[PDB]
Write a protein that binds this ligand. Structure first.
Ligand SMILES: Cc1nc2ccc(Br)cc2c(-c2ccc(Cl)cc2)c1[C@H](OC(C)(C)C)C(=O)O
Ligand SMILES: Cc1nc2ccc(Br)cc2c(-c2ccc(Cl)cc2)c1[C@H](OC(C)(C)C)C(=O)O
Ligand SMILES: [As]
Ligand SMILES: [As]
Ligand SMILES: [As]
Ligand SMILES: [As]
Lengths: 148, 148
């Protein structure tokens, strides 16, 4: 479906903590991290990290206020990210599933942050089996083809 | 050169802090993070995170003691990682370069951790221009081909 440089980024809450989830919209691949607080600095830093790893051209969010601080706009400026406008908003979600996966592994770990990376791993390696690729395989296929 | 599932993982120090650098040996692509201390818990957690994102089968290090705690061995156990034995050790380095890149951007950021992600970004997007791919492009080409 979508252009290969579009990501969605949102926060969810669990155990009084904050989880920042990035989804590569064309593949369903996710990167996620437990942040100590839902702040502009945390998002800017996560954006730098994400952009260093994948070719990130536009990012969408379901809370536009998330991207208004100069701190975040400076990270996008530096990394060359645009904020996406082609996905409008209805008053996905691969955020519910990652909440279901976390509950399922929650007791395998003391910290939520560990349970989260467990769930990311399971999500990205899960064979979405129809011709049955995982999201980890799909992102790589999509970005590689878009190069070659 | 190398199998597409081999990574090298090491720590370096800067500004009294610790930087954990993972290199995808076949492509030169790096992921790096500033950790508060050089501990088994930090490495296990980083391993979970790395394995959720790329198909990681073996990891090498230049300090074998790094991987001896049960904490780390449990992360590899869970993620299905083997510790690599096919790269022997002479009594790379893409660790020096990332130290050169950091110095070059150091004043663009208050925190070292920010400067580090800046340097990762520059390193991975740098056109190694001979037929002139970047490490970010090469990793994706290598893993995709190894699927298809
Ligand atoms: C705090 C912790 N302590 C441990 C102590 C001994 C052992 Br054996 C494993 C862990 C693990 C542990 C748990 C699961 C896996 Cl797969 C690997 C290590 C954790 C996990 O935290 C990290 C990964 C940050 C170290 C956790 O959240 O429970
Ligand atoms: C602490 C900090 N405060 C800021 C305050 C205002 C503005 Br405008 C930018 C920053 C940036 C800043 C610097 C560079 C870029 Cl590219 C984006 C934001 C940082 C950087 O830290 C992060 C990314 C964690 C917020 C830094 O280390 O200096
Ligand atoms: As958020
Ligand atoms: As932006
Ligand atoms: As280390
Ligand atoms: As291991």
């Amino acid at each position: 479906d979508c252009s290969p440089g579009i990501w969605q980024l949102d926060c969810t809450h669990l155990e009084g903590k904050v989880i920042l989830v990035a989804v590569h919209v064309a593949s369903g691949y996710i990167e996620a991290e437990v942040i100590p607080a839902e702040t502009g600095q945390e998002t800017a830093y996560f954006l730098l990290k994400l952009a260093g790893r994948w070719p990130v051209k536009t990012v969408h969010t379901d809370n536009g206020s998330n991207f208004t601080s100069t701190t975040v706009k400076t990270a996008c400026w530096w990394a060359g990210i645009k904020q996406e406008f082609g996905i409008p908003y209805n008053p996905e979600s691969m955020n519910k599933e990652l909440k279901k996966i976390i509950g399922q592994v929650r007791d395998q770990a003391e910290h939520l942050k560990t349970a989260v990376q467990m769930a990311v791993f399971i999500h990205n390696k899960k064979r979405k089996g129809g011709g049955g690729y995982s999201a980890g395989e799909r992102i790589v296929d999509i970005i590689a083809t878009d190069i070659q």
